[PDB]
Structure formats: C-alpha cells, structure tokens
From a paper:
The NHL domain, or so-called NHL repeats named after ncl-1, HT2A and lin-41, forms another protein module found in four TRIMs, including TRIM2, TRIM3, TRIM32 and TRIM71, that constitute the subclass VII. Here, high-resolution crystal structures of the NHL domains of three of the four human TRIM–NHL proteins, namely TRIM2, TRIM3 and TRIM71, are presented. Comparative structural analyses revealed that, despite sharing an evolutionarily conserved six-bladed β-propeller architecture, the low sequence identities resulted in distinct properties of these interaction domains at their putative binding sites for macromolecules.
The NHL domains of TRIM2 and TRIM3 were highly expressed as a fusion protein with an N-terminal His6-GST tag in E. coli. Crystals of TRIM2 NHL were obtained within 1–2 d, while TRIM3 crystals grew within one week and TRIM71 crystals formed after approximately one month. The TRIM3 NHL structure was determined at 1.7 Å resolution from the tetragonal crystals that contained a single molecule in the asymmetric unit, whereas the monoclinic crystals of TRIM71 NHL diffracted to 2.2 Å resolution had an asymmetric unit consisting of two protein molecules. Nonetheless, an exception was noted when comparing TRIM2 and TRIM3 that were most similar with ∼82% sequence identity. In contrast, the rather shallow flat surface of the TRIM2/3 NHLs resembles that of their homologue DmBrat, which has been shown to recognize a linear RNA. However, comparative analyses suggest that similar binding of an RNA observed previously in DmBrat would be unlikely in TRIM2/3 due to the lack of a central channel as well as low sequence conservation within the pockets.
Author numbering: 469 to 744
C-alpha cells in the first residue's frame, strides 16, 4: 500500500544480484532490463520483478561488455548498451545475441542511451560531452553539444530521454541541470539548479518522460526522484520513505505505468507507482 511496488536485488555477482547497477530500461513487451557496469552483464526481469535471464561476456572484443553503463530497449525489443570502456554502443537481440556495434571511432565515452520516436538511437557521451543520433544500422544522422556550461554545452551528461515531440532531455550530472533540445539539436530550455530545494539537484542521473510529457529525474547526491511537468516545473518527489534510495542511477517507465530506478548504493532496483 506504498508508492514502492517491489524491490529486486542484493550485493553480489550471481543472477538477481548487482555490483554496480547503472542503466535501466523497459520493453513494451513488459520486461525490465538492467545493466551492471562492474558485473559486465545485462539482466532481464518481468514487469513484476521475476528473473528471466542474464547475458554478457566480459571483454574488449565486439560482442563483449567491458563497462556497460546505459541501456535502452528498441520497439522490436533489441537491447542497446552503451559501453563506456569499449567506446561503442552494442545492439543485442531481445534474447541477448550480439548483432552489431555503432559509433566505434566517433564515441569517446558513451555513457547513456535512449530510443527516439523514429527508432533513432540517442547516445550521450560523457567524454566529448555531446549527444549523437544514429540509425539502428550505425549511420550517424546528428550530433550536438560540446564540453561547457552554456545552454548548448554539457559539463558531464550521463543520461538521456526522448519525449512525445521527439525532443531530447539530457541530465547534466556536473551542471546540476536538465536541458531539453529539438530532435535536430536546437536548445529549447533548461531547468534545475544546485541544491536540496524542490527542483534543485546534487548531480542528476536517470531520466524518463511519460506520455503526458512529465519529466522524471533521479538525483544521485540527494538520493531522491523528482517529477516535473513538461515546462520543468516541480510537481512531486517519488515517495521512497519505506525503503530509501542511496545514490540512484538509471530511471525508466514501464508499460504498466511504474517508475523503475537503479538504487545503485543499495544494490537493487525498485519499482514505484507515481500519481501523474
């Protein structure tokens, strides 16, 4: 009878355990997909938290995972992994079969990924501080950003989401802000500032956008999740009181309308109801 619906995971390297849980995504087929950067693996669960399967071969060769940070699920259920250390994005089948890698030689530190409304793969690079837009096949179609603190630049972007207008929503871990851009890279607006007040951050991480354009943002340093309207107005905190967060990372919205968070500091993921 809590905003918390369920919790899955504990510390370790076995199936249903985590060392460094970072990326979170959801499939329309009603699955939850999580990446562990330190166990170098992807784990797939039902919408109720039941373990389905784990995949990932450790290493630096194509097909293999070295530091998988960011994950996204395509409309066909393909699993898209940002590998920060291999410096590419791996696309797998919904069953964990390597298909191809995109952005090799262009991405220097791919951290976060999303899928847009035309099936483009959106990658945020924490080393070049840029946002890349690819076709599934690997073809680059767009790039914007650059290191800095101006509205068109990023200081250290780790996560990305796309809204109903195909607009790109980037969290800036080091700037304490969220910035929103057109599909073409045009800056639209920013919100958030450094602090603990409503609509302030101490290092934003995961981000998701709902069907109503509400933007949901995890706050790593403040161990909390904020919900905003489409203009970046604070609406609420997710009520985490029953089982507090500790350093949350990825965020995703499921097909059954729950917010799932990588509660990395507690070695688990948690699913929430939220009222919008």
């Amino acid at each position: 009878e809590d905003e918390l619906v369920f919790r899955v995971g504990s510390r370790g390297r076995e199936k249903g355990e985590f060392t460094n849980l970072q990326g979170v995504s959801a499939a329309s087929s009603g699955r939850i997909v999580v990446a562990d950067s330190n166990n170098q693996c992807i784990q797939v669960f039902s919408n109720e938290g039941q373990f389905k399967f784990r995949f990932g071969v450790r290493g630096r060769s194509p097909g293999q995972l070295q530091r998988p940070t960011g994950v996204a699920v395509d409309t066909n259920g393909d699993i898209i992994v940002a590998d920060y250390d291999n410096r590419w994005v791996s696309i797998f089948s919904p069953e964990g079969k390597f298909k191809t890698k995109i952005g090799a030689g262009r991405l220097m530190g791919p951290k976060g990924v999303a899928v847009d409304r035309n099936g483009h793969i959106i990658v945020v690079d924490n080393k070049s501080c840029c946002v890349f837009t690819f076709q599934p096949n690997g073809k680059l179609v767009g790039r914007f950003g650059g290191r800095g603190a101006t509205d068109r630049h990023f200081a250290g972007p780790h996560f990305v989401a796309v809204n109903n207008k195909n607009e790109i929503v980037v969290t800036d871990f080091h700037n304490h802000s969220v910035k929103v851009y057109s599909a073409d890279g045009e800056f639209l607006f920013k919100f958030g500032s450094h602090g603990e007040g409503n609509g302030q951050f101490n290092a934003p991480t995961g981000v998701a956008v709902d069907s109503n354009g509400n933007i949901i943002v995890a706050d790593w340093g403040n161990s909390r999740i904020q919900v905003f309207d489409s203009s970046g107005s604070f609406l609420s905190y997710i009520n985490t009181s029953a089982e507090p967060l500790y350093g949350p990372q990825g965020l995703a919205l499921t097909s059954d309308g729950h917010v799932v968070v990588a509660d990395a500091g507690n070695h688990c993921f948690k699913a929430y109801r939220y009222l919008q």
